[PDB]
Design a protein around this ligand. Structure first.
Ligand code: D48
Length: 222
């Protein structure tokens, strides 16, 4: 398959990304608590459902939530201010809460079943969100970093295999603050550092110029 792109909703961020996040890729966004990673995830879950002329892929979404941070009412707001029907947008987001890191790993295998079911339809899965990818692994493997890296490595390999095999954009969030961070090391296809700036602006930079955007009723925008 050719490489598809999903607009983030922000022209600035899209330019930094070469058009949007890529299918057949894992995009990892990392930054402190409150930097806007989950807002970007919510926006992408709407944007992907637009036609390509508007920066989408007419795609379905799968969302794995580890922190109970998915908000359908926020999806509705973004959809209504992106000219989509909110009920239709929500109907094309498959949502699961991961209870712990082992369940999170099983949910990625389950996602493959729904990906296969929709593959030949007019609304194939085009976006898989894992928010937050690292939170359960971090809490469960305190004092056991070597074992944590083993399990994370397999989890990321699973996510790569889905991105490439099924032409999906995988978007993952990772909270990194004070003294923290191996990030995801070199595992993602693309690392994006997100941070707060003056006056509520958000600033994004590729790790390995800068885009500036705001969080609004449209999700994110310049
Ligand atoms: O109905 C489902 C929703 C999911 C969402 C994310 C990951 C896996 C899922 C599996 C389902 O059957």
């Amino acid at each position: 398959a050719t490489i598809g792109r999903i607009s983030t909703g922000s022209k600035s961020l899209d330019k930094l990304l070469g058009g949007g996040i890529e299918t057949q890729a894992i995009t990892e966004v990392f930054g402190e608590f409150g930097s806007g990673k989950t807002q970007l995830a919510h926006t992408l879950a709407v944007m992907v459902q637009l036609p390509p002329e508007e920066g989408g892929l007419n795609g379905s979404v799968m969302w794995i939530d580890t922190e109970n941070t998915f908000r359908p009412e926020r999806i509705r707001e973004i959809a209504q201010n992106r000219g989509l029907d909110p009920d239709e947008v929500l109907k094309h987001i498959a949502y699961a809460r991961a209870f712990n890191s082992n369940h999170q790993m099983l949910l990625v295998q389950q996602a493959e079943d729904m990906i296969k079911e929709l593959l030949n339809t007019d609304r194939p899965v085009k976006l898989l969100i894992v928010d937050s990818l690292t939170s359960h692994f971090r809490s469960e493997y305190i004092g056991a970093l070597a074992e944590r890296q083993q399990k994370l490595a397999k989890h990321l390999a699973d996510l790569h295999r889905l991105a490439n095999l099924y032409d999906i954009a995988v978007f993952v969030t990772n909270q990194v603050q004070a003294n923290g961070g191996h990030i995801l090391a070199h595992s993602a296809t693309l690392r994006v550092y997100l941070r707060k700036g003056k006056g509520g602006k958000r600033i994004a930079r590729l790790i390995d110029g800068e885009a500036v955007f705001s969080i609004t009723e449209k999700g994110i925008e310049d």
